[PDB]
Design a protein around this nucleic acid. Structure first.
Ligand SMILES: *C(=O)[C@H](CCSC)NC=O
Ligand SMILES: [K+]
Ligand SMILES: [K+]
Ligand SMILES: [K+]
Ligand SMILES: [K+]
Ligand SMILES: [K+]
Ligand SMILES: [K+]
Ligand SMILES: [K+]
Ligand SMILES: [K+]
Ligand SMILES: [K+]
Ligand SMILES: [K+]
Ligand SMILES: [K+]
Ligand SMILES: [K+]
Ligand SMILES: [K+]
Ligand SMILES: [K+]
Ligand SMILES: [K+]
Ligand SMILES: [K+]
Ligand SMILES: [K+]
Ligand SMILES: [K+]
Ligand SMILES: [K+]
Ligand SMILES: [Mg+2]
Ligand SMILES: [Mg+2]
Ligand SMILES: [Mg+2]
Ligand SMILES: [Mg+2]
Ligand SMILES: [Mg+2]
Ligand SMILES: [Mg+2]
Ligand SMILES: [Mg+2]
Ligand SMILES: [Mg+2]
Ligand SMILES: [Mg+2]
Ligand SMILES: [Mg+2]
Ligand SMILES: [Mg+2]
Ligand SMILES: [Mg+2]
Ligand SMILES: [Mg+2]
Ligand SMILES: [Mg+2]
Ligand SMILES: [Mg+2]
Ligand SMILES: [Mg+2]
Ligand SMILES: [Mg+2]
Ligand SMILES: [Mg+2]
Ligand SMILES: [Mg+2]
Ligand SMILES: [Mg+2]
Ligand SMILES: [Mg+2]
Ligand SMILES: [Mg+2]
Ligand SMILES: [Mg+2]
Ligand SMILES: [Mg+2]
Ligand SMILES: [Mg+2]
Ligand SMILES: [Mg+2]
Ligand SMILES: [Mg+2]
Ligand SMILES: [Mg+2]
Ligand SMILES: [Mg+2]
Ligand SMILES: [Mg+2]
Ligand SMILES: [Mg+2]
Ligand SMILES: [Mg+2]
Ligand SMILES: [Mg+2]
Ligand SMILES: [Mg+2]
Ligand SMILES: [Mg+2]
Ligand SMILES: [Mg+2]
Ligand SMILES: [Mg+2]
Ligand SMILES: [Mg+2]
Ligand SMILES: [Mg+2]
Ligand SMILES: [Mg+2]
Ligand SMILES: [Mg+2]
Ligand SMILES: [Mg+2]
Ligand SMILES: [Mg+2]
Ligand SMILES: [Mg+2]
Ligand SMILES: [Mg+2]
Ligand SMILES: [Mg+2]
Ligand SMILES: [Mg+2]
Ligand SMILES: [Mg+2]
Ligand SMILES: [Mg+2]
Ligand SMILES: [Mg+2]
Ligand SMILES: [Mg+2]
Ligand SMILES: [Mg+2]
Ligand SMILES: [Mg+2]
Ligand SMILES: [Mg+2]
Ligand SMILES: [Mg+2]
Ligand SMILES: [Mg+2]
Ligand SMILES: [Mg+2]
Ligand SMILES: [Mg+2]
Ligand SMILES: [Mg+2]
Ligand SMILES: [Mg+2]
Ligand SMILES: [Mg+2]
Ligand SMILES: [Mg+2]
Ligand SMILES: [Mg+2]
Ligand SMILES: [Mg+2]
Ligand SMILES: [Mg+2]
Ligand SMILES: [Mg+2]
Ligand SMILES: [Mg+2]
Ligand SMILES: [Mg+2]
Ligand SMILES: [Mg+2]
Ligand SMILES: [Mg+2]
Ligand SMILES: [Mg+2]
Ligand SMILES: [Mg+2]
Ligand SMILES: [Mg+2]
Ligand SMILES: [Mg+2]
Ligand SMILES: [Mg+2]
Ligand SMILES: [Mg+2]
Ligand SMILES: [Mg+2]
Ligand SMILES: [Mg+2]
Ligand SMILES: [Mg+2]
Ligand SMILES: [Mg+2]
Ligand SMILES: [Mg+2]
Ligand SMILES: [Mg+2]
Ligand SMILES: [Mg+2]
Ligand SMILES: [Mg+2]
Ligand SMILES: [Mg+2]
Ligand SMILES: [Mg+2]
Ligand SMILES: [Mg+2]
Ligand SMILES: [Mg+2]
Ligand SMILES: [Mg+2]
Ligand SMILES: [Mg+2]
Ligand SMILES: [Mg+2]
Ligand SMILES: [Mg+2]
Ligand SMILES: [Mg+2]
Ligand SMILES: [Mg+2]
Ligand SMILES: [Mg+2]
Ligand SMILES: [Mg+2]
Ligand SMILES: [Mg+2]
Ligand SMILES: [Mg+2]
Ligand SMILES: [Mg+2]
Ligand SMILES: [Mg+2]
Ligand SMILES: [Mg+2]
Ligand SMILES: [Mg+2]
Ligand SMILES: [Mg+2]
Ligand SMILES: [Mg+2]
Ligand SMILES: [Mg+2]
Ligand SMILES: [Mg+2]
Ligand SMILES: [Mg+2]
Ligand SMILES: [Mg+2]
Ligand SMILES: [Mg+2]
Ligand SMILES: [Mg+2]
Ligand SMILES: [Mg+2]
Ligand SMILES: [Mg+2]
Ligand SMILES: [Mg+2]
Ligand SMILES: [Mg+2]
Ligand SMILES: [Mg+2]
Ligand SMILES: [Mg+2]
Ligand SMILES: [Mg+2]
Ligand SMILES: [Mg+2]
Ligand SMILES: [Mg+2]
Ligand SMILES: [Mg+2]
Ligand SMILES: [Mg+2]
Ligand SMILES: [Mg+2]
Ligand SMILES: [Mg+2]
Ligand SMILES: [Mg+2]
Ligand SMILES: [Mg+2]
Ligand SMILES: [Mg+2]
Ligand SMILES: [Mg+2]
Ligand SMILES: [Mg+2]
Ligand SMILES: [Mg+2]
Ligand SMILES: [Mg+2]
Ligand SMILES: [Mg+2]
Ligand SMILES: [Mg+2]
Ligand SMILES: [Mg+2]
Ligand SMILES: [Mg+2]
Ligand SMILES: [Mg+2]
Lengths: 112, 29
RNA sequence: ACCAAAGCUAGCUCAACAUACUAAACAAAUACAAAAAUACACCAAAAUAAAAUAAAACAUUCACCUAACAUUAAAGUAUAGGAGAUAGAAAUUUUUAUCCUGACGCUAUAGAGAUAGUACCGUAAGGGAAAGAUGAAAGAAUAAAAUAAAAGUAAAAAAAAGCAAAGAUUACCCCUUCUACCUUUUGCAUAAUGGUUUAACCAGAAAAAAUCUAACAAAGAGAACUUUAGCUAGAUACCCCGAAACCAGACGAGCUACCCAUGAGCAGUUUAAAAGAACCAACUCAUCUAUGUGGCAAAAUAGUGAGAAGACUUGUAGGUAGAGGUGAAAAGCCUAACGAGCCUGGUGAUAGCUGGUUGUCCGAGAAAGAAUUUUAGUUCAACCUUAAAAAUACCCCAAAAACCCUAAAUUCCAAUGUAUUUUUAAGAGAUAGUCUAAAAAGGUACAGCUUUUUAGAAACGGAUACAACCUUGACUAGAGAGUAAAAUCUUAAUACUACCAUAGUAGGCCUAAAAGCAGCCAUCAAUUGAGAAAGCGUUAAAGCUCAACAAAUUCACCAACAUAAUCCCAAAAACUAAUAACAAACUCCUAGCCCAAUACCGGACUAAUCUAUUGAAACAUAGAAGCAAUAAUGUUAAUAUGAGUAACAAGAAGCCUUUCUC
RNA sequence: GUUUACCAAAAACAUCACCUCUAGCAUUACUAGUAUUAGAGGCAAUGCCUGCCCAGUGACACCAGUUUAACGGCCGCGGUAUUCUGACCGUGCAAAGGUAGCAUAAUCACUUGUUCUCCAAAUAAGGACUUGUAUGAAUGGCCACACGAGGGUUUUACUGUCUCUUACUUCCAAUCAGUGAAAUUAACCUUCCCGUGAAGAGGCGGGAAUAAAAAAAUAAGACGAGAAGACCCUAUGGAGCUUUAAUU
RNA sequence: UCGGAGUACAAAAAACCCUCCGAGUGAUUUUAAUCUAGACAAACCAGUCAAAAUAACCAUAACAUCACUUAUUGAUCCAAAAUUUUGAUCAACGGAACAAGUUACCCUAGGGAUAACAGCGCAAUCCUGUUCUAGAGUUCCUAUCGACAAUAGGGUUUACGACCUCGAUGUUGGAUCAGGACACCCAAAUGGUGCAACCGCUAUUAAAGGUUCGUUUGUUCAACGAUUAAAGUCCUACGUGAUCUGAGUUCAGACCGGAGCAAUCCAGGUCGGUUUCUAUCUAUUAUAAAUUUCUCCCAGUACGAAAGGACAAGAGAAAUGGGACCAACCUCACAAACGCGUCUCAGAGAUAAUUAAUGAUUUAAUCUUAACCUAAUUAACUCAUAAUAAAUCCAGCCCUAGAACAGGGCACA
RNA sequence: AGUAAGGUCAGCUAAAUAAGCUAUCGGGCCCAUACCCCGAAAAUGUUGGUUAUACCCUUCCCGUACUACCA
């Protein structure tokens, strides 16, 4: 007969994880890009409008499993928490960047 | 080449045939 | 020993100088149909060049391409361009005369086409060759000297067997081992392409950026420019053959289509007929068949046919010319090819397409991701080559990477093992893939099928033969040695035989009839022993047999599956001792010059020419190029094979030229 | 009568006839003519006929409009007389809805339609039946005389066409004498069978056969020789023809 | 062209004329600024995020939101608008500023990279055999058949793939000559039967020989007439055109119907239409030892209620095929050749299915991949037998011998 | 096979404002029937989705239509 399926061709968006644990990253480097929320941002990690994770401070990237406390203004998320049984807590994975360089140091500029 | 599952007792690779012949069952004597 | 071989002149090429540029010969005849002494005339003319090509198509555009007055610079700048391809000035600058001119140009397939625009092929425009060799004397031809070396033959035919050879061997064969060579492909002994063989001739060319060497250096360069180590100079580079076509100008209607002039043919026979009537010759066309097919003939011969007083055949001569002529339209004919002639010029037209591409040796060495009137091609990325700089590359433990279920396993990373990797500067090729194992998809859970991902391979050994499977780190020499993959695969299977039968009772029900034996229901009971029945049978009965008596005691689940076409296919073998043996490009042993390859790239040497200096029985260091041919249905010339084969011709006798036969 | 000189001589073209169209006129055609003339075309004598349609296109008028012997066109759905058929009726669209005639034809397919005659036997031939839903009226329909190197069928007569080949002559042929060519050719010391293999082997593998040469024959193979396949596809390769392609 | 899910199971990437959903924009107001560290992605062109800093406004305020939110889009040049800015189903969506048909009148460069014919691969389709019995067969599975299903093999048909050939592998049917297979049509032997006999149905074994002549069609096929012991199936480049045929397909001409405004087109029909080759090599160029039908007879017997009606054995005559010959007839104008005419044509061994005897494993029985002996029994095949037979005159002439070369005669002829 | 394309009252048409004609049903006129006049009833093939429906899309079903070519 004839083909009925159309438009199935599309290149991948290269969504995935960029920096593994232990990689030394600087401020602005994109830790990971994702379609849905696969890894939630953690300490010293921002979040762009396209749900990409970028480090805010120079340091070492670390991955961690932590608890999830949703924003009360998010109606869908708080509803899921409400229906949970008393003995359960949500767990999500997070990406952290432990700072390495200190904020600054004091040096002698003038001795009057 | 043929599929993984066929209807005609797919002929094994010659190296695999030696494997099937050296791993036979020898009943105790 | 024939055929052949050798020679160095003829002359030519590119300049320079230069008079200033249609030669030589013109007695007579020369534009009547040229080379024919002699009569009232006409005579003459101009209209932009177009296109093949480039823009990967093609419409605007496309250098030079008729007419510039040059050189050093301004400058490939200003501008003009489907602003694409490419096209491209000027203002303003520079330039000292005459001699010193000859040759790192050829030597008879070269150099002009040339011994010559002559032979010869074309009606015409036009195309256009091959061809020379003695010596001081050939007024030394019983003449002399020289290579006796190409293919092809002769001297001298051949003796089983094989890409014609190698290993050898006392010995030519006999033995053993080897699927011609290029091109083109995933893969060719292939029955895919090309070549009969020999000689001669025939195909890589450019310097912007770069690397190597050198001069001078914050400056370099013999003006005009470039400059934050640069500038100047040298060296290192990019082919040949081929279309159908397109445009312009010439020459062709002596063949043929049609027409205008001027002529010439149609006998007999039949009819008041010279009626596009009738029979049949000359004459003109060419229906059918057979010979012929490199033929007698680039369209014919033999037989047979149609017209034959007309819209008919035919001679001479003239007219219409390619964007056209002509046509009783067949897209016919216009000089043996006309969906539009031929010749020359534009022309070395242009081809992503086919074929070809000439010495030795050595180093490293790539199968496809993305766009594309693009998938027969290009331009990028990856990979790779040459040179250079730098520091980290592979392997990589623990930790770490998602939410319903989910395998093999990947990503990332210290150690460790090992030398690899990145960056910078130059680059081309490739971008048409085949199978095996693994995970999938389409299909017939078909294909030597097709589309992707991971991995492997493309032995001169093994699977008899064999691109893809297995053994293998591809050097040279040896008449040494150890080993790896590996050589005939299993079963071809099933005997089951004694003895013996009687009770209630045709159990109830059911049905035409149901007596163990359609069905329903129940399944008790005599006898030590035997089921209200396991099978067969009867319309229903009867009857046979099997369970139970006794007798008696090898073992007994299961395992059976037709055939193809030229002629079956190593020969053969059940036991003398087997973790044997024989067996490679692997690995040891003795010496070394110390490890394969297609496209592309790198390096070292070198045959033969000329020139600058050496050399002086034929070379050395350098500088230059018409610098190397087993392959283009290659060119010219010469040789073979087919083959002494196909095919060709003269009537007889005699007294020789006269009589006979047709 | 004419045509594809060199594979088609015909059913093609031409042709007398009929019809449409354009032109009122002078020194080179038409024409030394003047609408009973002359050109641009169609269709094919004669005979009987040539039906309906200017909506579209074209032409004319160049305005309304007029023209089909100008290019061209010339219909559905549903019901209805016991059954069948459909005179008739409802409804819709059109510029009109295929009229006369002929017909399984040279006429898509169905197709070897059905039937009769011809034959011992008929996918042939002739005569009828006939929606041919794709026949059809000067892109002409239909009928007939004569004519035809056109195409098909039948009877009669003849015969080597054939059942079934044979005899004898001439040109070829083979031997002798003379002259002496062509396509072709990688090298060949040039076998058969099965198997293998770029999938059809003289050459590889496993086996068989095997003194060497000459002359005369038959054509199975050498994917025989001949023409860089005419079929097919590809090429940002050509050309001829047509127009409602683009530019002009 | 762009996005989402599976193929792509766990970092990324990853294809098909693969399987399923979408997009070529709306609604609303929070109308969303300037400037810069660092990165994801990627051939390129493009696409994406983004701290700090400045301005805006709670006076130390930057993510427009929702619809699977992911896609909702277009490069230069050029054109228009104020200079801010805008412009394409350029959808062939990395886009030529603007361009359709047909060629069977075709041409050129190439491709077996790519089709038609043939081989090969494969077996969907096709063919052949077996396993399984529900049932058909009055009762009765398998005398003859056998649904729903199982399994093995053949390579004939139409397909599928595009692997060898497009610097050519010539293509249907006939004519000639046939080579081969057996899944056998006839001829021979045999088992079973719903087999009395006759005529049949079915199965096993056997391939030496044989398998007709005509009307229509180009036909293979098929229908029909007549006959035969039977008019087999199939392979061989659906054998065979360097042997022939060209009616059909399959060029250029021409009509009819249809499609197209036309040029032209139609696996739609009709009429016409060049069939080349001198053989280099390989291969090859005569032994025989028959086969079938019909008649008569057995016999109107066997067998059957009757109707019907045999086999074996015996005898004879023809036909085809192999190999020969002219007395006659006939072809016949040579003394010969020739058919339409005449002549001749064979014994033994050996077997397959199947049938029977003796007999053990199993003291019965049982034809025995149990032994010994022995019997009835297809065709091939093999052989008896028959043909051939002398080594070494050969110039010349003749010949019923012959292409050449050979061979037989030449004493009485 | 593929593509194209349609279904609406009993029937045929036009619109989606489901209308018009006819048929069918009731009544009147006439001696009766028909004509004629008057009144009433009647449907969007099918499934799902189209803000909600209909003209649309989708599914199912019937039937219609073109093409099937070069060797
Ligand atoms: C099929 O017809 C084709 C020829 C086309 S041109 C007559 N066959 C070729 O072999
Ligand atoms: K070839
Ligand atoms: K080729
Ligand atoms: K070649
Ligand atoms: K003339
Ligand atoms: K001649
Ligand atoms: K190309
Ligand atoms: K009973
Ligand atoms: K004629
Ligand atoms: K009109
Ligand atoms: K008829
Ligand atoms: K004629
Ligand atoms: K032959
Ligand atoms: K494009
Ligand atoms: K198949
Ligand atoms: K071919
Ligand atoms: K036979
Ligand atoms: K040969
Ligand atoms: K005779
Ligand atoms: K037994
Ligand atoms: Mg993709
Ligand atoms: Mg996807
Ligand atoms: Mg595979
Ligand atoms: Mg161009
Ligand atoms: Mg080009
Ligand atoms: Mg020009
Ligand atoms: Mg401009
Ligand atoms: Mg010369
Ligand atoms: Mg020379
Ligand atoms: Mg010589
Ligand atoms: Mg040898
Ligand atoms: Mg090979
Ligand atoms: Mg190939
Ligand atoms: Mg290649
Ligand atoms: Mg070859
Ligand atoms: Mg080729
Ligand atoms: Mg050749
Ligand atoms: Mg330079
Ligand atoms: Mg041009
Ligand atoms: Mg011209
Ligand atoms: Mg003339
Ligand atoms: Mg006369
Ligand atoms: Mg006459
Ligand atoms: Mg003529
Ligand atoms: Mg003649
Ligand atoms: Mg003749
Ligand atoms: Mg004659
Ligand atoms: Mg005549
Ligand atoms: Mg006549
Ligand atoms: Mg002229
Ligand atoms: Mg013309
Ligand atoms: Mg004429
Ligand atoms: Mg014509
Ligand atoms: Mg024509
Ligand atoms: Mg000519
Ligand atoms: Mg060229
Ligand atoms: Mg590719
Ligand atoms: Mg590159
Ligand atoms: Mg780990
Ligand atoms: Mg590391
Ligand atoms: Mg390519
Ligand atoms: Mg592949
Ligand atoms: Mg494959
Ligand atoms: Mg392929
Ligand atoms: Mg790979
Ligand atoms: Mg080997
Ligand atoms: Mg080694
Ligand atoms: Mg018992
Ligand atoms: Mg059988
Ligand atoms: Mg053998
Ligand atoms: Mg060894
Ligand atoms: Mg190497
Ligand atoms: Mg290659
Ligand atoms: Mg030198
Ligand atoms: Mg040279
Ligand atoms: Mg040479
Ligand atoms: Mg040739
Ligand atoms: Mg050559
Ligand atoms: Mg010579
Ligand atoms: Mg010779
Ligand atoms: Mg010869
Ligand atoms: Mg001769
Ligand atoms: Mg005539
Ligand atoms: Mg002709
Ligand atoms: Mg003719
Ligand atoms: Mg009239
Ligand atoms: Mg008429
Ligand atoms: Mg006519
Ligand atoms: Mg006519
Ligand atoms: Mg009319
Ligand atoms: Mg009008
Ligand atoms: Mg009639
Ligand atoms: Mg008629
Ligand atoms: Mg018809
Ligand atoms: Mg006929
Ligand atoms: Mg006939
Ligand atoms: Mg008739
Ligand atoms: Mg018609
Ligand atoms: Mg008309
Ligand atoms: Mg007509
Ligand atoms: Mg007349
Ligand atoms: Mg006639
Ligand atoms: Mg007769
Ligand atoms: Mg001779
Ligand atoms: Mg030999
Ligand atoms: Mg073979
Ligand atoms: Mg061999
Ligand atoms: Mg051998
Ligand atoms: Mg001869
Ligand atoms: Mg011969
Ligand atoms: Mg060969
Ligand atoms: Mg052949
Ligand atoms: Mg050939
Ligand atoms: Mg070619
Ligand atoms: Mg063609
Ligand atoms: Mg292209
Ligand atoms: Mg072109
Ligand atoms: Mg061109
Ligand atoms: Mg032209
Ligand atoms: Mg136009
Ligand atoms: Mg990146
Ligand atoms: Mg900020
Ligand atoms: Mg542009
Ligand atoms: Mg594109
Ligand atoms: Mg893209
Ligand atoms: Mg462009
Ligand atoms: Mg034609
Ligand atoms: Mg060609
Ligand atoms: Mg390919
Ligand atoms: Mg063939
Ligand atoms: Mg084929
Ligand atoms: Mg073949
Ligand atoms: Mg099979
Ligand atoms: Mg039954
Ligand atoms: Mg099967
Ligand atoms: Mg192929
Ligand atoms: Mg060839
Ligand atoms: Mg035959
Ligand atoms: Mg035979
Ligand atoms: Mg048999
Ligand atoms: Mg029989
Ligand atoms: Mg054949
Ligand atoms: Mg034939
Ligand atoms: Mg022939
Ligand atoms: Mg042949
Ligand atoms: Mg013909
Ligand atoms: Mg016509
Ligand atoms: Mg004829
Ligand atoms: Mg014909
Ligand atoms: Mg011969
Ligand atoms: Mg011959
Ligand atoms: Mg008898
Ligand atoms: Mg016994
Ligand atoms: Mg014997
Ligand atoms: Mg003698």
């Amino acid at each position: 007969g004839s083909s009925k399926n159309l438009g199935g061709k599309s290149p991948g968006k290269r969504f995935g994880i960029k920096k593994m644990e232990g990689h030394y990253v600087h401020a602005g480097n994109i830790l990971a890009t994702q379609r849905h929320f696969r890894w939630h941002p953690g300490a010293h990690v921002g979040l762009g409008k396209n749900k990409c994770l970028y480090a805010l401070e120079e340091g070492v990237v670390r991955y961690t499993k932590e608890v999830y406390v949703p924003n009360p203004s998010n109606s869908e998320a708080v509803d899921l928490v409400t229906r949970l049984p008393q003995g359960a807590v949500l767990y999500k994975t997070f990406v952290h960047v432990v700072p390495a360089k200190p904020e600054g140091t004091f040096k002698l500029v003038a001795m009057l | 080449g043929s599929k993984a599952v066929t209807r005609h007792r797919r002929v094994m690779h010659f190296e695999r045939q030696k494997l099937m012949a050296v791993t036979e069952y020898i009943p105790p004597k």
